[PDB]
C-alpha cells in the first residue's frame, strides 16, 4: 500500500553518540554524489530545528490524560 | 594529465598543462 | 450596446473597487488555505444561472 | 494557540521591510548593513510559534525552563569586526529577556 | 570605511525608532489575558518565584 | 443541420462579454450585505444564529469573483463554530434567495471551492481530468491550423503536466514519446531535432555522457534556460568534445581547447536552436505553407557559427554551490496534492524554495534609458528585478509562479563571492542595472539543478564586469 | 521578529474586543469535570492508606 | 517485442540508460511516420495481460436502436429532439451508425456520410435534414481530439517500455505496475477487435483534418469515439501519476454504463459528481493525527496580505462536523446502477483516520477518475435549452 | 470652471520637472532627494480642478467647511528619518493655509 | 606520516576565506587588500606534509 | 568502462564510473 510506499521513501530522504571523539573514529560539474552532499546538509538543518525536535502529531496516553 | 581551472581546457602532458 | 451602456459599468466599477471591496479582480490560494484551515469552516456560495438571473423584474428597474 | 485566538494584535515583518527601504547607503561598498538584518530576521523553518510558547512559558518555570537553543549562538563564538556576528548579538541581546 | 559607518548609524536609529505594538502590549494586555486563561485550563499554574 | 436559421427573443445576457461580469459582482456583494444586515435578523429565532449572522460582514470575510462567492467563518476561542447554528443560516440563505430569483447552489462539508480550485485542511488539490490529453475543444465545423502548429498543444500538454505533480520521470519519458511522435511531416520531409524541443523548455535526461535524470523540468525556456543546463555541464561537455576528436589549437574562454562550433554544426544543436525560434504561426492558403516551409527548411540547411549575441554575453558568468538553505517550509505538511517524497523533485524544490505564501511602454523606456540618453521619474529610479530585467526580454517563466522567486532573488542569490571580492565582478556605479539580470542566471541554475535549491555565489566573469554590459548594450543597438 | 514588529487592529476598542473574545469560551467552561475528579482521586489515595 | 526491435537504441536514450543523441532521435522519428494504423493494434495484441485487467463488458454497447424515433421537426421547420430521461436530455443520443454510409474510394472498409442524403436535405426532404443533422453531430462529436489516438497509444507503447526507472534522490527503483496490469488498455483492445471481429484493419474510424470516416459494419454506433478517447486518458494517467488500480477499474466501469447508456454524454453530465461527493465532501468522518498550515490575513482585510506561521498538530475535535452524505450518494447510485462504485467508494473513503500525504493522495487519485470529455451538441438547442429559462419572483414590489 | 474661465494664469507643469534637472548628487547614492519629489508631486494637468474649488470655498465658510483628505496624510506617523514622509510634510505645509 | 595519526590538530582553510570576507572596501578601488592576499595564501592541502 | 550494476546506467572513462 501507499501508507508504507511513502514511509519508506521518507526513510529513504531521512537517513544518518554524546562520546569525546577518538583517533579511530574553481569549478564543478553536476554529479548525484554533489546532489546527495547537498540533500544530507538541508536534512540536518532542518533536523536540528528546536520546534521539530520535539514536536509529535499524536498524543500519547499520558498526553491525553 | 588532466584539465585546468580558468577555462576548463583540457592537457594531455603536465608540463605544458603548467 | 458598448456606446451607450457606459455609466452602467462605470458605476458597477466604483462598487467593486471603493465600496465593498469583496471582489479579488494569485491571491486565490491564501484565501483558501486560510479558509480550509481545522478552527475555521468555509460555505461555497454558487449562484445558479447568472446570466438568465437579473431581468427588468427586480434587479434593472431599480 | 488560544493566546494566539484570543490575542488582539498580530506579527507583520512588513514594518521592517518598509522602514529598511528608506535607508542612506551607497552601492559601491562591498556589505550593507539594511540588507543583513533582512537576511538574519528569517528564521529556519518560517515558524514564529516560539513567542507565544514562550509567553505561555510563564505559567510554568516550576517543571519548564524555556531557555533559547544552541543553534542560535554565532557559530562557537564570533568576532566584533564581523557585522553579522553584531546582527546576532542584537537578536540574541532582544530575545533573552522573555 | 566612511559610508558602511554612516548607513550603520542610520540603521541603528531606525532599529531603535521603529514603531511597534509589541512592547506595550507585553506591558498591558497580556497580563489581562493570562489572567482570564489561567483558571480554565486542563494543567494548573504552577509556579516557583 | 441545413435549414436551420431563425430568431429569438430573450431576457439573459450574452455568455462571455467584460462589463457583465463587474456589475453581476456588484450584484453578488451588495444582496449579500443586505442579507447579512437586514434580512438576516428580521427572519430568524435561535439566537446562536442571531450572534453569528451579527459577527461578520462582507468586508471581512465574504469572498466573489462572478457567480460564485466563498464565505468564511472563522474560529472562536472556545475551537470550532458548532457546525448545526451554520446549516440553519444555510437554510435562511436558501430562503433569502427564493424571494427575488436566485438559486444558490450553497455547499458546506468541510472544504473551499472557490475560482473552481479545490482544498482541504489546505491542500492545493488539481483537478487532472480538468483538462485532458488527448481532449480539444472545436466549436465549428473549419478545419484546423495546418502541421507545424501542433507542437504548442503538445507544450501544452506537458506544461498543464508541470502544474499537477505527476510523476516526473513517467511524465518527462512519456513527453519524450509524444516530443519524437510529432515531428516529421510530408512536404526531403520535414523534421524538427531533438535541440529545438529543449529550447521549448523540455528537460532532458541524460546527455553528454552525464548522470541519468540530472535536470529538472523548473528550468526556463529560452535563452535563460540555454545558459543554465549549459553552465552546470559545461567542464564534461569540453571532456566529451575531445572525447572524440573534436579538438582545435586555441582555447575559448567557455569549452576551452574544443571546436564548438563544428562538434554543434555536426550534432545539429545550431540548428535546432535557430530553427526553434521560427514563428509557427502561418501568417497572412497552401503557397503560404510552401513558404513557411521553405523558410524553415532554410534554417536546416544553413550551417551556424555561434549561439545568439544575448546567450554568448550569457556565458561569461560563472557561479557555485557552496551549501544548501535553510528550509522555507515543514516536511512533514502537506502543503500540495500529489507531491510528496515518492515525488522527490517538487518535494525538495517547494520545501527549499517555498510556497507563494504572502509592457511596451515599460520596455522601450527601459532601453532608452540603460542607453546613454513619470518621464521625468524613470531617469534615477529602479524598480525591482522582474521588472528591470525585462530589457533582455527575461522573464519569470510560467513554471515558478506557484513558488517564492521574490525571496530567493533579494536574499539568497548574492552577487559577491564567499572569499571578498575577486575584483573580476566588479559591476561599475554606473549601469548598476546589470545586477537585475544576473539575479536570473544565478537563479536559473538553482531551480535546473534537481533537489535542493541551493545558496548560489557569484564566481566569476570571464571578460570583466564593466565589458560584460558592453556586449548588452551592442544588442540594445542592434535591437 | 515579534519583538521588533507588531500591529494592533486601526480600529481597536479593547473592550468590545476582548467581550467578543472571551465570551464563547465561558458558557460552555467544562472545567468543573476537573474538579469531579479531583475528588475522586484524593477519595482514593486515603482508601487505600 | 516488436516495439523492442523497432525501437532498440531510443528507449535506452529516454530511460536513463543510454545518451541521448540527435541521430537516434531522427531514426526514430523516421519510424514514428511509418506505420499503418493497424500496426498500433498488432503492437496491441502481443501484451500478456494479467487477471486484474479482465472485467465484464457489457454486449449491449454494439446494439443501439436507430435514430427516427430520436428527433423531429418543430413547427418554424427546425430540427430539434424528444427528451426521454428529464428536459436536459439534448445531446447526442447512440445508435446505429452504418445504415447512413457509403464507402470512400482507395479503401472499401471506411465510410462517410453519404451525398444523396445531403442533396435531398439541402433540397427540403423532411428525413434527410434529421439524417444529416445526425450524421453532423456526430463528426463533431467524435472530432474533439488533438490528434488521432493511435499516435497517443503509440507513445504510451513506446515510452512505458523501458521498465521501471531509477530514482538519483531516493536511490531505488519505483514500484508502478507495468502494461500487464492495465485495465482501460484491455478494454481499448478488446472494443477494436469487437468491433471489426473476422474483418481485417481493425481501426473503428479515422481521423482526418475535415471530418472522419467511420468502420462499415453493424456493430459500430456513435458512443465509441468518445468511449476510446476517454479510456485513452485514463491509460495513460494509470501509468504516469501512479493511480490505484482499484480506482481506474470503477473509473473505466462508469464510462462502460456510460457508452451502454441511452446517451453517453448525457449519462456523463448527470454522473460528473460521483468521485467528489463520495470521496471529498467525506473526509475525516474520525481525525486523530496531522498537520495544518497555521494562516492569518493581515487586519486591513481588504488588502488580502496574508502571512505563514509554521504548522501545527491537528487534534481530536477537528473532525468532520458538517452534516452527512450517506442518504443522497447513496440515492444517485442506485437511481443509475452504480451501487456497486459508490458503496465502494464510501467503504475505502472511511478507512483514512490520518492526514498525511497518503491521504491526500487518495484524494488526487480518486478525483482523476472523473472522465474529462467536452459536451457537444448543436447550438439550435444549446440556446433552447439555455435561453428560455427565465427567474421566479416569488416577493415582487408592490405597485 | 467660471473662474478658470477667466484666469488669466495657467498650469506649466514642466516647470518643477526643469528645476530639477540641476540638482547636484551621486549616481552611487539609493536615495535620490531630486527625484523623489517628482514622483510625490507629480503634475497631470487636472490640478486646477481641485485647487479653483477651495479657491470658491472661500466664499461659503458656514456651510461649507473644506479641509484636506484623509488620504494625503502619512499613513501612521512616519519617522523623521525616512524621505518620503519629510516631503509627505511639505505638501501638507504648503496647502493648509489654502 | 607518524605525526599525522597522533595529532588532533586539523587545519581548516576555510577560517581565512572565512574571516576575509567581511572587510569593508570600495569597489571604485583597484587594489583589494582583502582579496590580494588570498591570491597570496592560496589555501590548499598539502599544507599539512 | 561500459556500465555499473546499480541502475542500468551506461559510461566510459572508469575514473567516471569508480
Ligand atoms: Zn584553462
Ligand atoms: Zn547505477
Not at chain 3, 473597487?17 to 479558509?35: D, F, Q, R, W
Not at chain 6, 566588479?426 to 535549491?453: E, H, N, Q, S
Not at chain 8, 502494461?179 to 478488446?190: A, G, K, T
Not at chain 8, 457537444?376 to 444549446?382: D, F, I, K, Y
Amino acid at each position: 500500500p501507499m501508507s508504507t510506499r511513502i514511509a519508506e521513501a521518507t526513510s529513504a530522504i531521512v537517513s544518518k553518540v554524546g562520546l569525546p571523539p577518538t583517533a579511530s573514529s574553481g569549478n564543478m560539474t553536476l554529479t548525484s554524489s554533489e546532489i546527495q552532499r547537498h540533500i544530507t546538509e538541508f536534512i540536518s538543518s532542518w533536523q536540528n530545528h528546536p520546534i521539530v525536535q520535539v514536536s509529535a502529531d499524536v498524543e500519547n496516553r499520558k498526553t491525553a490524560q | 594529465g588532466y584539465q585546468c581551472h580558468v577555462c576548463s581546457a583540457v592537457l594531455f602532458s603536465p608540463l605544458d598543462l603548467d | 450596446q458598448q456606446q451607450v451602456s457606459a455609466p452602467h459599468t462605470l458605476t458597477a466599477d466604483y462598487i467593486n473597487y471603493h465600496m465593498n471591496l469583496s471582489t479579488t479582480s494569485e491571491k486565490v490560494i491564501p484565501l483558501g488555505v486560510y479558509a480550509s484551515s481545522p478552527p475555521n469552516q468555509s460555505i461555497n456560495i454558487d449562484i445558479s444561472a447568472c446570466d438568465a438571473s437579473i431581468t427588468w423584474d427586480f434587479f434593472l428597474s431599480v | 494557540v488560544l493566546l494566539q485566538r484570543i490575542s488582539p494584535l498580530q506579527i507583520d515583518p512588513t514594518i521592517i521591510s518598509n522602514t529598511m527601504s528608506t535607508v542612506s547607503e551607497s552601492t559601491t561598498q562591498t556589505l550593507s548593513p539594511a540588507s543583513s538584518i533582512l537576511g538574519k530576521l528569517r528564521p529556519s523553518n518560517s515558524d514564529f510559534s516560539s513567542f507565544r510558547v514562550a509567553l505561555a512559558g510563564w505559567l510554568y518555570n516550576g517543571v519548564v525552563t524555556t531557555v533559547i537553543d544552541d543553534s542560535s549562538y554565532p557559530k562557537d563564538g564570533g568576532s566584533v569586526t564581523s557585522l553579522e556576528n553584531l546582527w546576532d548579538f542584537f537578536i540574541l541581546a532582544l530575545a533573552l529577556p522573555l | 570605511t566612511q559610508s558602511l559607518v554612516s548607513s550603520m548609524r542610520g540603521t541603528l536609529g531606525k532599529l531603535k525608532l521603529i514603531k511597534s505594538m509589541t512592547p506595550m502590549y507585553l506591558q498591558q494586555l497580556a497580563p489581562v489575558e493570562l489572567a482570564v486563561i489561567a483558571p480554565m485550563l486542563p494543567f494548573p499554574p504552577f509556579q516557583v518565584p | 443541420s441545413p435549414g436551420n436559421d431563425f430568431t429569438h427573443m430573450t431576457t439573459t445576457f450574452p455568455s462571455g462579454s467584460t462589463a457583465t461580469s463587474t456589475e453581476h459582482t456588484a450584484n453578488n456583494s451588495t444582496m449579500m450585505e443586505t442579507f447579512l444586515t437586514v434580512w438576516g435578523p428580521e427572519h430568524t429565532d435561535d439566537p446562536d444564529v442571531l450572534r453569528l449572522m451579527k459577527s461578520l460582514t462582507i468586508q471581512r470575510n465574504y469572498v466573489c469573483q462572478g457567480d460564485d462567492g466563498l464565505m468564511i467563518i472563522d474560529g472562536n476561542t472556545a475551537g470550532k463554530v458548532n457546525s448545526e447554528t451554520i446549516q440553519k443560516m444555510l437554510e435562511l440563505i436558501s430562503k433569502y434567495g427564493e424571494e427575488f430569483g436566485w438559486k444558490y447552489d450553497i455547499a458546506y462539508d468541510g472544504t473551499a471551492e472557490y475560482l473552481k480550485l479545490y482544498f482541504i485542511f489546505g491542500c492545493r488539490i488539481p483537478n487532472l481530468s480538468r483538462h485532458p490529453i488527448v481532449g480539444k475543444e472545436r466549436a465549428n465545423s473549419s478545419a484546423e491550423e495546418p502541421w507545424p502548429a501542433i507542437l504548442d498543444q503538445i507544450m501544452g500538454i506537458f506544461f498543464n503536466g508541470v502544474h499537477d505533480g505527476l510523476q516526473w520521470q513517467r511524465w518527462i519519458r512519456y513527453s519524450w514519446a509524444l516530443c519524437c511522435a510529432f515531428s516529421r511531416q510530408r512536404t526531403g520531409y520535414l523534421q524538427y531535432p531533438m535541440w529545438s524541443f529543449v529550447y521549448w523548455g523540455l528537460p532532458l535526461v541524460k546527455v553528454f555522457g552525464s548522470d541519468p535524470w540530472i535536470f529538472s523540468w523548473y528550468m526556463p525556456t529560452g535563452d535563460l534556460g540555454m545558459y543554465s543546463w549549459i553552465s552546470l555541464i559545461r567542464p564534461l561537455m569540453t571532456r566529451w568534445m575531445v572525447a572524440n576528436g573534436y579538438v582545435t589549437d586555441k582555447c575559448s574562454p567557455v569549452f576551452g581547447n574544443a571546436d564548438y562550433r563544428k562538434c554543434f554544426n555536426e550534432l545539429k544543436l545550431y540548428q535546432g536552436y535557430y530553427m526553434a525560434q521560427l514563428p509557427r504561426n502561418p501568417k497572412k492558403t497552401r503557397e503560404e505553407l510552401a513558404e513557411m516551409d521553405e523558410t524553415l527548411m532554410r534554417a536546416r540547411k544553413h550551417s551556424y557559427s555561434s549561439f545568439s549575441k544575448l546567450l554568448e554575453a550569457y556565458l561569461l558568468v560563472k557561479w557555485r554551490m557552496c551549501e544548501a538553505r535553510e528550509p522555507s517550509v515543514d516536511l512533514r505538511l502537506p502543503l500540495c496534492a500529489g507531491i510528496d517524497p515518492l515525488n522527490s523533485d517538487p518535494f525538495l524544490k517547494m520545501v527549499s524554495v517555498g510556497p507563494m505564501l504572502q509592457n511596451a511602454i515599460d520596455s522601450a523606456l527601459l532601453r532608452l534609458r540603460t542607453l546613454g540618453a513619470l518621464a521625468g521619474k524613470i531617469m534615477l529610479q529602479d524598480v525591482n528585478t522582474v521588472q528591470l530585467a525585462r530589457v533582455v526580454n527575461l522573464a519569470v517563466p510560467d513554471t515558478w509562479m506557484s513558488l517564492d522567486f521574490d525571496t530567493m532573488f533579494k536574499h539568497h542569490v548574492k552577487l559577491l563571492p564567499k572569499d571578498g571580492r575577486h575584483l573580476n565582478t566588479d559591476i561599475p556605479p554606473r549601469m548598476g542595472w546589470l545586477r537585475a539580470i544576473l539575479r536570473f542566471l544565478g537563479a536559473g541554475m538553482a531551480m535546473t539543478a534537481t533537489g535542493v535549491a541551493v545558496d548560489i555565489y557569484l564566481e566569476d566573469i570571464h571578460g570583466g564586469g564593466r565589458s560584460l554590459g558592453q556586449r548588452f548594450m551592442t544588442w540594445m543597438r542592434q535591437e | 521578529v515579534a519583538l521588533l514588529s507588531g500591529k494592533y487592529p486601526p480600529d481597536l476598542v479593547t473592550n468590545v474586543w476582548y467581550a467578543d473574545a472571551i465570551y464563547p469560551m465561558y458558557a460552555d467552561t467544562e472545567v468543573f469535570s476537573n474538579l469531579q475528579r479531583d475528588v475522586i482521586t484524593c477519595e482514593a489515595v486515603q482508601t487505600l492508606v | 517485442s516488436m516495439i523492442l526491435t523497432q525501437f532498440g537504441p531510443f528507449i535506452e536514450s529516454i530511460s536513463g540508460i543510454t545518451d541521448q543523441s540527435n541521430d537516434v532521435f531522427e531514426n526514430a522519428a523516421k519510424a514514428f511516420s511509418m506505420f499503418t494504423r493497424s500496426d498500433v493494434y498488432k503492437a496491441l495484441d502481443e501484451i500478456p495481460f494479467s487477471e486484474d485487467a479482465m472485467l465484464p463488458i457489457p454486449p449491449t454497447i454494439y446494439t443501439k436502436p436507430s435514430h427516427d424515433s430520436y428527433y423531429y421537426i418543430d413547427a418554424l421547420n427546425r430540427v430539434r429532439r424528444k427528451t426521454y430521461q428529464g428536459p436536459d436530455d439534448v445531446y447526442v443520443p447512440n445508435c446505429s451508425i452504418v445504415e447512413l454510409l457509403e464507402p470512400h474510394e482507395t479503401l472499401t472498409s471506411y465510410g462517410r456520410l453519404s451525398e444523396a442524403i445531403e442533396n435531398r436535405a439541402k433540397d427540403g426532404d423532411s428525413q434527410a435534414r434529421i439524417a444529416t443533422t445526425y450524421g453532423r453531430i456526430a463528426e463533431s462529436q467524435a472530432r474533439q481530439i488533438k490528434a488521432p489516438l493511435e499516435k497517443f497509444v503509440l507513445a504510451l507503447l513506446v515510452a512505458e517500455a523501458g521498465g521501471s526507472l531509477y530514482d538519483p534522490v531516493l536511490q531505488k527503483y519505483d514500484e508502478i505496475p507495468g502494461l500487464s496490469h492495465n485495465c482501460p488498455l484491455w478494454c481499448f483492445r478488446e472494443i477494436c477487435r469487437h468491433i471489426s471481429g473476422p474483418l481485417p484493419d481493425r481501426a473503428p474510424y479515422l481521423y482526418l483534418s475535415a471530418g472522419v470516416f467511420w468502420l462499415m459494419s453493424p456493430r459500430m454506433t456513435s458512443a465509441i469515439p468518445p468511449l476510446l478517447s476517454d479510456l485513452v486518458n485514463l491509460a495513460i494517467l494509470q501509468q504516469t501519476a501512479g493511480l490505484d488500480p482499484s480506482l481506474v477499474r470503477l473509473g473505466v466501469q462508469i464510462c462502460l454504463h456510460a457508452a451502454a447508456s441511452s446517451s453517453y454524454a448525457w449519462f456523463i453530465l448527470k454522473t460528473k459528481s460521483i468521485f467528489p461527493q463520495n470521496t471529498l465532501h467525506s473526509m475525516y468522518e474520525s481525525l486523530e493525527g496531522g498537520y495544518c498550515p497555521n494562516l492569518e490575513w493581515l487586519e486591513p482585510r481588504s488588502d488580502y496580505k496574508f502571512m505563514y506561521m509554521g504548522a501545527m498538530p491537528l487534534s481530536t475535535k477537528y473532525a468532520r462536523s458538517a452534516p452527512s452524505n450517506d442518504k443522497k450518494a447513496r440515492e444517485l447510485g442506485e437511481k443509475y446502477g452504480l451501487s456497486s462504485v459508490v458503496s465502494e467508494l464510501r467503504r475505502r473513503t472511511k478507512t483514512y483516520s490520518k492526514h498525511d500525504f497518503t491521504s491526500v493522495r487518495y484524494i488526487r487519485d480518486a478525483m482523476a477518475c472523473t472522465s474529462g470529455i467536452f459536451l457537444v451538441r448543436t447550438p439550435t438547442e444549446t440556446v433552447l435549452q439555455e435561453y428560455t429559462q427565465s427567474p421566479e419572483i416569488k416577493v415582487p414590489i408592490p405597485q
